[PDB]
Each structure stands twice: as structure tokens, then as C-alpha cells.
A paper describes a structure:
The light-producing reaction catalysed by the Renilla-type luciferase is one of the most widely used biochemical reactions in molecular and cell biology research.
To verify the importance of the hotspot regions highlighted by biophysical analysis, we transplanted the sequence corresponding to the L9-α4 fragment from the modern RLuc8 enzyme into the ancestral AncHLD-RLuc. Thus, AncFT’s lower LUC activity is due to a lower rate of the chemical transformation (i.e., the step after binding), as indicated by a 10-fold lower kcat value for AncFT compared to RLuc8. The half-life (t1/2) of AncFT bioluminescence was two orders of magnitude longer than that of RLuc8, being consistent with a significantly lower Km/Kp ratio determined for AncFT, in comparison to RLuc8. MD simulations of AncFT revealed that the B-factor profile of its cap domain closely resembled that of RLuc8.
Numbering used by the authors: 12 to 305
């Protein structure tokens, strides 16, 4: 399935000064509702082979984060976590959601989805997360060895690799998928970023927001610190951690979340973009989680 076919199935809604594009399996329905949040450097297209397995049981929504996918681009090029949260939270308010929702999230979609849940604690039916942002990094030995990669990315050299060479799309993305994408699938990930320069800014700002205890950013640090604490006591929020083997962050998330209450773990084959290697198993697991809910 090509990008054209996927975004043909999506709609747009005005959000503050801009627009956001999103998949909606059942517009205007207050039945069981599941919202799928992608991260960097992907779009709603990441969920295309997962959502079919969930669609029969729930209205499925998959927004493109601001500056990503088919969503609008910000003239001032400022795409910090808080900028993404302003737009994403306004999107939540704009798609006729029922009172309680299930969030399925990945990577920075999980940072945003964890934060939105933490700020709307009475609206969360359940949370499925995978290769997620579950904590601040306080000791490097409990995380994959990215210290050097992050200092690089924060440097001007890293701006040149991302803005001019598209490092995140052309290198990081295929590096962390076990199979080989088709040309059509890769072109769908490329589509939002074909213009060199500032169109690729969201893919550079996202890794610069990594919460490193003592490297800032202190706004992200305390957002993550506060939703981690709440999730670590979230005894009556059903939670599914989908573990990717070998994964990337999965090993560290296993350790971080080991004693989180009310959390079931399922393991699938994948690296970081586990949706491209095991979409059927991931879909079936979310359906099982949904049926365990009802």
C-alpha cells in the first residue's frame, strides 16, 4: 500500500492556526475508540497494517503529528514537545471523541500520549505502548549506548546530517526495520520530507528533546518525570507493553516498567520500528487487550 492510497483514506481538521491529517475508521461515532500515536520520523502510515486488526472492534484514529505526515507545517519551525502537545491536544478536542479512549503509542507518540493521559486521567480506558519514552535517562548504563549519538545530533554537524542529508529517514529508519521496505513504502516515509532544509526540522528536534537527567530540556524532564510517577502507580489503568525482540529501547523499558502495576507484556519480533516487522501480532495483541477490557 502506497502513501497515496493511505492518505486518500485520511481526513483533515483545522487545529489552531493549522491543519492536521488523520486516519478515522468511523467518523462521528462514540463507540469504543482507539487513538494510535506515531513518533519520529514516521506518520500515521506506520499503523497501516496494525489498524485493520483493531478496526472491527473500535473506531481507530491515527493522526499525523504537526509538521509530519500530511499535517501542516509551522512557519516558525519550532517543534518542541510542548509545541507538538499544543496541536495534538487541540486535535483530541476536535475529532468528537467519547469520554474514555484507549491510547496505542510508539516512540515520541508515547511521550505525548503518556502526557495527555497524565493530564486527563479520567478519560483513559487503557494504554498500549511499545518502544516508548517511559522515563528520564539518569544513568547511561541502563539504556542503549546513545550518549555519543545524542551529543552528535545536538551539534551543528547533526543539523547538517538531518536537514541536508535526511539522516533520520534515509539511515536511522531502515536501520531499525528487520525486513526491507518496498520502494513504495519508503517513498511514503519520505513524502513529508522531500524538500531539503526546514521540512525535516521535526526529525531533528525530536532527538534533541530526549530527557537526559542533567542535559535538559528541563520542561520535558519534568513532564516525563510526572507521567512516569503516575504510570508507576496506575493500578487501575490497564496497560499493555509490547516488547520488541531485540528491539532498541525495549530492554530498558522492561527494566523501567518491571514493577508498574496492571501491566501485561507481549513480545514480538522487531527492532525499533516493530510495526513494520510484526504488524499482525501487534494488531492481534491490541485486539486481545481490547477484548480483555470489555
Amino acid at each position: 500500500a502506497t502513501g497515496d492510497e493511505w492518505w486518500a483514506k485520511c481526513k483533515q481538521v483545522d487545529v489552531l492556526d493549522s491543519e492536521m491529517s488523520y486516519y478515522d475508521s468511523d467518523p462521528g461515532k462514540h463507540k469504543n475508540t482507539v487513538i494510535f500515536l506515531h513518533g519520529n520520523p514516521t506518520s500515521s502510515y506506520l499503523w497501516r497494517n496494525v489498524i485493520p486488526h483493531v478496526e472491527p472492534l473500535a473506531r481507530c484514529l491515527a493522526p499525523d503529528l504537526i509538521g509530519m505526515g500530511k499535517s501542516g507545517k509551522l512557519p516558525n519551525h519550532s517543534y518542541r514537545f510542548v509545541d507538538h502537545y499544543r496541536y495534538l491536544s487541540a486535535w483530541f478536542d476536535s475529532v468528537n471523541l467519547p469520554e474514555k479512549v484507549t491510547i496505542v503509542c510508539h516512540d515520541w507518540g508515547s511521550g505525548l500520549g503518556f502526557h495527555w493521559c497524565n493530564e486527563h486521567r479520567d478519560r483513559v480506558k487503557g494504554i498500549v505502548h511499545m518502544e516508548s519514552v517511559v522515563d528520564v535517562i539518569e544513568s547511561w548504563d541502563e539504556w542503549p549506548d546513545i550518549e555519543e549519538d545524542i551529543a552528535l545530533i545536538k551539534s551543528e554537524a547533526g543539523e547538517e546530517m538531518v536537514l541536508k542529508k535526511n539522516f533520520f529517514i534515509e539511515r536511522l529508519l531502515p536501520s531499525s526495520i528487520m525486513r526491507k521496505l518496498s520502494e513504495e513504502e519508503m517513498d511514503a516515509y519520505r513524502e513529508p520530507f522531500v524538500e531539503p532544509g526546514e521540512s525535516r526540522r521535526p526529525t531533528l528536534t525530536w532527538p534533541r528533546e530526549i530527557p537526559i537527567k542533567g542535559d535538559g530540556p528541563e520542561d520535558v524532564i519534568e513532564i516525563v518525570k510526572s507521567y512516569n510517577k503516575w504510570l508507576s502507580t496506575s493500578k487501575d489503568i490497564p496497560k499493555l507493553f509490547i516488547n520488541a525482540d531485540p528491539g532498541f529501547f525495549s530492554n530498558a523499558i522492561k527494566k523501567v516498567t518491571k514493577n508498574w502495576p496492571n501491566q501485561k507484556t507481549v513480545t514480538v519480533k522487531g527492532l525499533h520500528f516493530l510495526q513494520e516487522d510484526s504488524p499482525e501480532e501487534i494488531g492481534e495483541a491490541i485486539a486481545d487487550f481490547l477484548n480483555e477490557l470489555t
